[PDB]
Design a protein around this motif. Structure first.
Motif, PDB file in Angstrom:
ATOM      1  N   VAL A  64      63.583   8.401  11.094  1.00 35.97           N
ATOM      2  CA  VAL A  64      63.504   9.198  12.557  1.00 35.97           C
ATOM      3  C   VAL A  64      62.663   8.343  13.433  1.00 35.97           C
ATOM      4  CG1 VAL A  64      63.076  11.237  11.105  1.00 35.97           C
ATOM      5  CG2 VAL A  64      62.186  11.001  13.444  1.00 35.97           C
ATOM      6  N   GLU A  65      63.038   8.316  14.520  1.00 33.16           N
ATOM      7  CA  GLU A  65      62.560   7.468  15.707  1.00 33.16           C
ATOM      8  C   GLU A  65      61.126   8.056  15.778  1.00 33.16           C
ATOM      9  OE1 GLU A  65      60.568   6.435  19.336  1.00 33.16           O
ATOM     10  OE2 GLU A  65      61.669   8.537  18.894  1.00 33.16           O
ATOM     11  N   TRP A  66      60.176   6.888  16.344  1.00 33.32           N
ATOM     12  CA  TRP A  66      58.524   7.162  15.930  1.00 33.32           C
ATOM     13  C   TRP A  66      58.062   8.410  16.916  1.00 33.32           C
ATOM     14  CZ3 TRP A  66      54.949   6.484  13.229  1.00 33.32           C
ATOM     15  CH2 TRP A  66      53.615   6.577  13.876  1.00 33.32           C
ATOM     16  N   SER A  67      58.622   8.221  18.051  1.00 31.92           N
ATOM     17  CA  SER A  67      58.054   9.284  19.108  1.00 31.92           C
ATOM     18  C   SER A  67      58.533  10.531  18.429  1.00 31.92           C
ATOM     19  CB  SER A  67      58.559   9.035  20.689  1.00 31.92           C
ATOM     20  OG  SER A  67      60.063   9.447  20.732  1.00 31.92           O
ATOM     21  N   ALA A  68      59.745  10.666  18.169  1.00 25.97           N
ATOM     22  CA  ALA A  68      60.198  12.129  17.667  1.00 25.97           C
ATOM     23  C   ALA A  68      59.273  12.683  16.472  1.00 25.97           C
ATOM     24  CB  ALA A  68      61.403  12.008  17.250  1.00 25.97           C
ATOM     25  N   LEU A  69      59.117  11.581  15.397  1.00 25.91           N
ATOM     26  CA  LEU A  69      58.779  11.936  14.260  1.00 25.91           C
ATOM     27  C   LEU A  69      57.148  12.509  14.551  1.00 25.91           C
ATOM     28  CD1 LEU A  69      58.907  12.035  11.249  1.00 25.91           C
ATOM     29  CD2 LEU A  69      58.193   9.686  10.863  1.00 25.91           C
ATOM     30  N   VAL A  70      56.662  11.764  15.502  1.00 28.25           N
ATOM     31  CA  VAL A  70      55.199  12.026  15.667  1.00 28.25           C
ATOM     32  C   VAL A  70      55.284  13.640  16.387  1.00 28.25           C
ATOM     33  CG1 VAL A  70      53.314  11.800  17.354  1.00 28.25           C
ATOM     34  CG2 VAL A  70      54.165   9.793  16.284  1.00 28.25           C
ATOM     35  N   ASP A 113      48.934   8.885  18.343  1.00 27.43           N
ATOM     36  CA  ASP A 113      49.781   7.958  17.717  1.00 27.43           C
ATOM     37  C   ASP A 113      49.193   6.527  18.077  1.00 27.43           C
ATOM     38  OD1 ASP A 113      52.187   6.447  19.377  1.00 27.43           O
ATOM     39  OD2 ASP A 113      51.545   8.220  20.042  1.00 27.43           O
ATOM     40  N   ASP A 114      49.270   5.231  17.120  1.00 28.26           N
ATOM     41  CA  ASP A 114      48.825   4.175  17.554  1.00 28.26           C
ATOM     42  C   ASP A 114      49.261   3.708  18.763  1.00 28.26           C
ATOM     43  OD1 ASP A 114      46.434   3.047  16.744  1.00 28.26           O
ATOM     44  OD2 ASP A 114      47.739   1.320  16.149  1.00 28.26           O
ATOM     45  N   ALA A 115      50.754   3.610  18.941  1.00 33.14           N
ATOM     46  CA  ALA A 115      51.290   3.055  20.046  1.00 33.14           C
ATOM     47  C   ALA A 115      50.757   3.462  21.446  1.00 33.14           C
ATOM     48  CB  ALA A 115      53.007   3.420  20.064  1.00 33.14           C
ATOM     49  N   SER A 116      50.689   4.743  21.539  1.00 34.35           N
ATOM     50  CA  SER A 116      50.163   5.356  22.607  1.00 34.35           C
ATOM     51  C   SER A 116      48.565   4.722  22.943  1.00 34.35           C
ATOM     52  CB  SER A 116      50.160   6.865  22.898  1.00 34.35           C
ATOM     53  OG  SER A 116      51.294   7.444  22.423  1.00 34.35           O
ATOM     54  N   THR A 117      47.928   4.749  21.922  1.00 32.08           N
ATOM     55  CA  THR A 117      46.336   4.271  21.918  1.00 32.08           C
ATOM     56  C   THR A 117      46.531   2.881  22.305  1.00 32.08           C
ATOM     57  OG1 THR A 117      45.882   5.926  20.460  1.00 32.08           O
ATOM     58  CG2 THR A 117      44.364   4.086  20.834  1.00 32.08           C
ATOM     59  N   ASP A 118      47.560   2.075  21.723  1.00 34.68           N
ATOM     60  CA  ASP A 118      47.722   0.494  22.407  1.00 34.68           C
ATOM     61  C   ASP A 118      47.543   0.226  23.803  1.00 34.68           C
ATOM     62  OD1 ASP A 118      47.384  -0.713  19.607  1.00 34.68           O
ATOM     63  OD2 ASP A 118      49.516  -0.863  19.569  1.00 34.68           O
ATOM     64  N   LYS A 144      57.054  -4.663  24.223  1.00 35.01           N
ATOM     65  CA  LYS A 144      58.509  -4.467  23.818  1.00 35.01           C
ATOM     66  C   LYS A 144      58.802  -3.767  22.540  1.00 35.01           C
ATOM     67  CE  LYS A 144      62.685  -7.308  23.948  1.00 35.01           C
ATOM     68  NZ  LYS A 144      63.278  -8.943  23.909  1.00 35.01           N
ATOM     69  N   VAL A 145      59.762  -2.765  22.889  1.00 31.63           N
ATOM     70  CA  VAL A 145      59.997  -1.822  21.787  1.00 31.63           C
ATOM     71  C   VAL A 145      61.098  -2.371  21.058  1.00 31.63           C
ATOM     72  CG1 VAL A 145      60.572   0.738  21.109  1.00 31.63           C
ATOM     73  CG2 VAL A 145      59.026   0.138  23.173  1.00 31.63           C
ATOM     74  N   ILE A 146      61.170  -2.483  19.621  1.00 34.64           N
ATOM     75  CA  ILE A 146      61.985  -3.045  18.939  1.00 34.64           C
ATOM     76  C   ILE A 146      62.221  -2.221  17.512  1.00 34.64           C
ATOM     77  CG2 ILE A 146      63.203  -4.997  17.755  1.00 34.64           C
ATOM     78  CD1 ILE A 146      61.208  -6.764  19.693  1.00 34.64           C
ATOM     79  N   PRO A 147      62.542  -1.224  17.455  1.00 36.54           N
ATOM     80  CA  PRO A 147      62.646  -0.188  16.089  1.00 36.54           C
ATOM     81  C   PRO A 147      63.374  -0.988  14.932  1.00 36.54           C
ATOM     82  CG  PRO A 147      63.973   0.626  17.702  1.00 36.54           C
ATOM     83  CD  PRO A 147      63.855  -0.399  18.369  1.00 36.54           C
ATOM     84  N   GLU A 195      57.658   3.209  19.952  1.00 35.49           N
ATOM     85  CA  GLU A 195      57.423   3.577  21.421  1.00 35.49           C
ATOM     86  C   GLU A 195      56.414   4.639  21.653  1.00 35.49           C
ATOM     87  OE1 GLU A 195      61.010   4.496  23.484  1.00 35.49           O
ATOM     88  OE2 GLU A 195      60.261   3.849  25.298  1.00 35.49           O
ATOM     89  N   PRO A 196      55.576   4.166  22.627  1.00 29.94           N
ATOM     90  CA  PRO A 196      54.503   5.401  23.058  1.00 29.94           C
ATOM     91  C   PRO A 196      55.333   6.589  23.525  1.00 29.94           C
ATOM     92  CG  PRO A 196      53.904   3.097  23.795  1.00 29.94           C
ATOM     93  CD  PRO A 196      55.453   2.997  23.212  1.00 29.94           C
TER      94      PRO A 196
END
Ligand code: ZN
Ligand code: ZN
Ligand code: ZN
Ligand code: ZN
Ligand code: ZN
Ligand code: ZN
Ligand code: ZN
Ligand code: ZN
Ligand code: ZN
Ligand code: ZN
Ligand code: ZN
Ligand code: ZN
Ligand code: ZN
Ligand code: ZN
Ligand code: ZN
Lengths: 9, 504
Positions: B380-386, B26-31, B204-207, B15-16
């Protein structure tokens, strides 16, 4: 374009 | 021929965080940013810089200035004209003493940015640096001054603009961000190059990569980077085709040198030597991908074709010996190495939903156990790990992670010691000799001279093993079989999505 942390791969 | 209509639903495992190129890392934000906003330039699928928002760019003073004319009649999503004011505003933000972002490296060569007319701006540089033309211009999303121009720069990152009220001039407009589920964007009917063909794009966020593959099969998503291990499964799915090529990326283990365990170069070299990276690729990627020994993508013109770098090829008994030489041995019969009253025990983090990286973390735990090193894995969840890896936190011992690399090859942003405090040197790497080489490399204009001097930088990074380099990944992009106008881009998965269409 600049470097970004990437989730995939 | 091209047909208007349709809805693309892009599956993403991350997730961005926010939509603002001055703050995102992060690439999700950048997308999402690349759909919402416009940029003075754009790097194409052959990695050439092309004009986008800019009408023209003139290099002056041998590279110490750039005179940029902006296309007229470009509108923000609120109907207001984009002008030089917006460009001057946006690029001036990271020059402020109150700028608190991690993207300072991209702008530090700038002395000033000046309005020369309603549609004209002059950039002036403090010293020559190819990162400006080749990276800053295509990375900097133009923001609306008439919205943000009076927000205190100290408070800009927190502004609601960056999450649920963004206004850009890009091909798609923000509709909704349902936290943890999706971001929905709608075609911008007034986009300066013409409306997108697609009516909507949903991110669509699918972790959970397996869940995303299942949704792809069902038609709940229709665009996804399929893991290599699932290729033969997905190629049978109805109504889809898969485009495959090398990504502009590498995956690595980052060893945080804030942690005592990872400060010694010889220990880091030993950790690499203890890891059977070929088996990792065979096991976890089903052989799809190549082991990485250099901090650059084979796609890069700067990738050293004829360099012999130290590889630290797998050798379990050598790793044991190297660790013993470095002072580590089990002194309490517990099976795990001991030094100065400390046990070699740490946590290895990676991002939720990347099953390949989750698997790598387990394989690293098993392989290092064999030489008396104890690793706890943590997903760890993406946004948190970033958030955790970035300043001011650096809240990890080690991580399995990737870079989407810059299209202009320069390692300064990631490995120069000046980039630890407020940039992307998350692992606290410092080699003063490498620092000097990276800094001095910026002034070298000819590409052959640049690439030649970069051989030395690669040697030093390879010798020092600030990371264990793991592999260069391939993308496997699944998309509707009737999707036309698509071109594979090794960095931007949704490159030129405004030009894609569904044949009917
Ligand atoms: Zn930050
Ligand atoms: Zn002046
Ligand atoms: Zn001036
Ligand atoms: Zn005027
Ligand atoms: Zn305005
Ligand atoms: Zn404040
Ligand atoms: Zn409309
Ligand atoms: Zn699952
Ligand atoms: Zn493949
Ligand atoms: Zn191979
Ligand atoms: Zn012990
Ligand atoms: Zn998982
Ligand atoms: Zn698995
Ligand atoms: Zn030296
Ligand atoms: Zn992406």
């Amino acid at each position: 374009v600049d470097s970004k942390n990437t989730s995939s791969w | 021929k091209p047909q208007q209509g349709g809805d693309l639903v892009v599956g993403s495992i991350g997730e961005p965080t926010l939509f603002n190129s001055l703050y995102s890392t992060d690439d999700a934000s950048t997308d999402i940013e690349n759909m919402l906003y416009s940029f003075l330039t754009k790097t194409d699928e052959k990695l050439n810089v092309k004009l986008s928002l800019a009408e023209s760019i003139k290099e002056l003073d041998g590279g110490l200035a750039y005179d940029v004319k902006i296309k007229k009649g470009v509108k923000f999503h609120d109907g207001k004209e984009l002008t030089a004011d917006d460009v001057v505003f946006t690029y001036s933000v990271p020059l402020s003493k109150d700028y608190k972002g991690e993207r300072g490296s991209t702008y530090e060569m700038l002395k000033s940015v000046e309005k020369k007319g309603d549609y004209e701006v002059l950039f002036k540089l403090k010293y020559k640096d190819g990162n400006f033309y080749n990276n800053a211009l295509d990375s900097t999303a133009i923001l609306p001054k008439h919205i943000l121009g009076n927000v205190p720069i100290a408070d800009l990152e927190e502004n609601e603009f960056n999450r649920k009220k963004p206004i850009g001039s890009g091909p798609f407009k923000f509709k909704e961000w349902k936290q943890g589920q999706y971001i929905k964007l709608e075609a911008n009917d007034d986009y300066f190059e013409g409306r997108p063909y697609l009516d909507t794009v949903t991110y669509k966020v699918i972790p959970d990569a397996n869940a995303a593959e299942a949704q792809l099969q069902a038609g709940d998503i229709n665009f996804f980077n399929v893991p290599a291990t699932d290729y033969k499964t997905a190629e049978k799915f109805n109504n889809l085709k898969i485009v495959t090529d090398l990504a502009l990326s590498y995956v690595y283990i980052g060893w945080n040198e804030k942690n005592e365990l990872f400060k010694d170069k010889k220990v880091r070299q030993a950790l690499t030597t203890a890891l059977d990276r070929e088996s990792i690729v065979s096991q976890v990627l089903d052989g799809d991908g190549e082991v990485a020994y250099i901090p650059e993508s084979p796609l890069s013109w700067n990738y050293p074709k004829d360099i012999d770098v130290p590889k630290f090829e797998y050798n379990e008994k050598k790793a044991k010996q190297m660790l013993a030489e470095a002072g580590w041995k089990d002194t309490n019969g517990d099976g795990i190495l001991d030094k100065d009253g400390k046990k070699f025990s740490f946590t290895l983090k990676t991002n939720q939903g990347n099953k390949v990286r989750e698997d790598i973390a387990v394989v690293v735990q098993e392989q290092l156990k064999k030489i008396g090193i104890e690793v706890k894995t943590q997903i760890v969840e993406w946004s948190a790990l970033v958030e955790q890896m970035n300043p001011p936190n650096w809240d990890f011992d080690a991580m399995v992670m990737g870079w989407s690399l810059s299209t202009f090859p320069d390692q300064y942003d990631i490995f120069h010691s000046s980039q630890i405090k407020k940039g992307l040197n998350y692992v606290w790497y410092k080699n003063a000799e490498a620092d000097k080489l990276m800094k001095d490399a910026k002034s070298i204009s000819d590409r052959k001279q640049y690439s030649k001097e970069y051989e030395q930088i690669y040697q030093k990074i390879a010798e020092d093993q600030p990371y264990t380099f793991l592999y260069y990944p391939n993308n496997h992009m699944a998309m509707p079989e009737n999707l036309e106008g698509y071109k594979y881009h090794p960095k931007r998965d949704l490159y030129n999505i405004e030009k894609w269409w569904l044949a009917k």
